[PDB]
């Protein structure tokens, strides 16, 4: 229950919302998909499996409608742990949320915000991350301490953490207007 992907900047969304490619989310959350299809379509599991096989070779629309409803009605929203090889710094592994699915079939890049990039101490040079989903509802509450919300305060001193602040060009943009 794991996958690897790349990084691509994404704008116009809250700081803890990411958008995953169509292919990877259609296979990581594979078993739960068959459960949703079975009840609505009124067929057994063997017949539903061959339907999912055809819905992953080429982009379609019937599967996508069931896909969108899954990330809206479920409790807490589908989440996963994202880390970076290697991890040597605090916050190199986070606990994010899913809020968007890319329509394109040829797109194979993970879209994250720009502010969250500095926490991983990485860049868009072409590194490969590891994605691990979490399933159990009771287990989620124990992992919530690793969310970026809990890393807002600096453990070193007790002040506002400088990593989760304006960096790179965003510093320059404010200065032009502020002055």
């Amino acid at each position: 229950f794991s996958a690897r992907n790349v990084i691509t900047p994404l704008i116009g969304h809250p700081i803890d919302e990411v958008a995953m490619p169509y292919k990877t989310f259609a296979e990581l959350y594979k078993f739960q998909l068959i459960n949703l299809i079975s009840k609505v379509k009124g067929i057994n599991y063997n017949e539903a499996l061959k339907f999912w096989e055809k819905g992953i070779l080429g982009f379609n629309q019937e599967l996508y409608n069931y896909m969108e409803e899954l990330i809206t009605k479920t409790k807490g929203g589908c989440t996963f742990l994202l880390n970076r090889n290697p991890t040597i710094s605090i916050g190199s592994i986070l606990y994010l949320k899913i809020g968007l699915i890319k329509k394109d079939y040829k797109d194979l890049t993970l879209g994250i915000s720009n502010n969250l990039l500095s926490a991983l101490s990485g860049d868009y040079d072409g590194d490969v991350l590891n994605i691990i989903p979490v399933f159990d509802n009771k287990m989620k509450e124990h992992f919530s301490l690793l969310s970026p919300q809990n890393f807002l305060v600096d453990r070193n001193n007790g002040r506002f953490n400088g990593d989760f602040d304006l960096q790179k060009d965003q510093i320059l943009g404010i200065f032009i207007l502020n002055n």
């Binding site: 229950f1 794991s2 996958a3 690897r4 992907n5 790349v6 691509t8 900047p9 704008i11 292919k23 990877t24 296979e27 990581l28 078993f31 739960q32 068959i34 459960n35 009840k39 599991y45 063997n46 061959k50 096989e53 070779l57 080429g58 899954l70 009605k73 479920t74 409790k75 880390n83 290697p86 991890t87 190199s92 592994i93 394109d104 040829k106 797109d107 194979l108 890049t109 720009n114 990039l117 860049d123 868009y124 040079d125 072409g126 490969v128 590891n130 691990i132 979490v134 399933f135 159990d136 509802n137 009771k138 287990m139 124990h142 992992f143 301490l145 690793l146 790179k168 060009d169 943009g173």
Partner: protein, 649 residues
Amino acid sequence: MDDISVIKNEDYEGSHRFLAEELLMPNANKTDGNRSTMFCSHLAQAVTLQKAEPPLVYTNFENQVGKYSTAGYRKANSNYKVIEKIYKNDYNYVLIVQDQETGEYTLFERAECEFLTEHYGFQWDNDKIDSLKKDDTIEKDTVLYKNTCYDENMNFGYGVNLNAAYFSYKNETLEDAIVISESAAKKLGTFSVNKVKVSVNTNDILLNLYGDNENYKGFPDIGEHIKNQIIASRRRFDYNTALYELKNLNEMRDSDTPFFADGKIVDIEIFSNVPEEELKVQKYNEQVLYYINKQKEFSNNVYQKLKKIVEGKDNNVSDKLLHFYNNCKMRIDENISYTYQNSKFSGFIMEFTILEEEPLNKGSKITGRYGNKGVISKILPDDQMPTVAEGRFKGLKADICLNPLGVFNRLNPSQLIEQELNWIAKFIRKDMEEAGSNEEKVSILLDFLNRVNKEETELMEEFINSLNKTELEEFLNDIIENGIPICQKPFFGNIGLDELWELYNHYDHIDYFKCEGISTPLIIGEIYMVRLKHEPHSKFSARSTSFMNLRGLPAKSKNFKEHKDLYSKTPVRIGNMEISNLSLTNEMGSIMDMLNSYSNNETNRRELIMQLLTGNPFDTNIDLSDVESGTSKILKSLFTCLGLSIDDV
């Protein structure tokens, strides 16, 4: 270290004898070493482009490099004379040619693809060889066929020229990111060709994927294109129970082994190990019986075509021709059995070569000559990109926007010089185009070339005065349309700073372009772009439940290498520090439960899978069980083999 004192700059004057792989990159005495050393690797990893163009600012050194690289073009060593040509397929055919100075014989084979490596290749632009027919004469300098890089007149080219500007677009260019217009994406392209080896045994059969029962087309035709990314699927057949298994062959079953590939199939070849009498009756093995026969026909042709040449008294043949003749005469004989991997296979095995064009997609990388590496982030329709709507030449639109933040911080001022040169070229070209007859037009050009590279002026004058009126007018129109080429050498002989200062001072009518909705002066130039090998689909991987290792832990499976699946179903391992960083939180039982139920305990894994599949999909409330894990048993067995045991309390 005082050994530097031997180096003296007196002798190293006006000669580039100390540069390797840097001859292509211009103004090499401006950028630092750390960025320059990346250019070598960038040139080492550069895929082929369909619409290759010669660079606008050339270093006058790539032509000889292209000539001395013999891996892309094939010319005639000596004057030949066509003897015969024979066909083998719809496209591929061979021809036998004879010398006029030694009497030897050689062969030339026309193709449609080339397998550079496991994934990347190119397509031959074979045009001259096709026009050759019916006992013509081949000269010394003629080129039979060439790659897509080389142009009509042997001029090299390994990239494209794109309008570029330095700009910031909604912070989408943070770090190293690039936006690109749709027209530039259409201009940029790439090729891809791959070979797939399918296998068939006596028990196995091929499903009727294409066509109805009248034409049991197991596999696509010679020139058709594949559909649904499935080339062929074979189903095992058992003697005991087949009544309820072969009822309908037009649909996939539960236990199938399909093969995945994408593109257009160009070349096939089939090798068989079964007697033809047994193969003549099987109805489902129909299409193969076609192609094999056709193949054999071709071989017979050669045995009846040039049998008078080699078997004759002359026998003056090259090694390649003799080897090919023996290989082709092997097949038509009797009682021959092939072998594969030093083993005798039972059923026949074929070959497929598939060609496909892959357009530019999000996530790819494109770099310039000076190693300003970037990554494509978001493509836009050409309307959104900035345009100039105030100057005389309203309409010019930038195609790529680069990061302006990291230009001085990266310590490489060559890009600014190149952009300024191309901008001054644009201005002088428009000024020449505005007015002026052919009598003085060239003068307006020459002045500009006088202050950039003094060596080029003499050749300019010689070439201009060499031609006649009509060709001169055509050349002037062409330079008006495309643009004035500017030449300058990498190390010795180029513009520095004082020359740029003087050039700016002399032209006083030049101002920055005023864009629309920007309120900041801007300059747009033309820069050289080369694609790179790195792609997102070559490393993307996902895994739900693949084959397990012998011990019980998940492990890498070799199925993607044989084109049996789409994704490289390889799990990602948790490292030494990953567990500790997870244990940063005071909770440990949750970590243990996750690890045990994910990749340690078989019963826990099965229980989790069942509880996830059946139940409530919206809300999950799984409850793991308590069963001794496999790793504990392995460790206990190993330690009791050593002679020690772990005791609690």
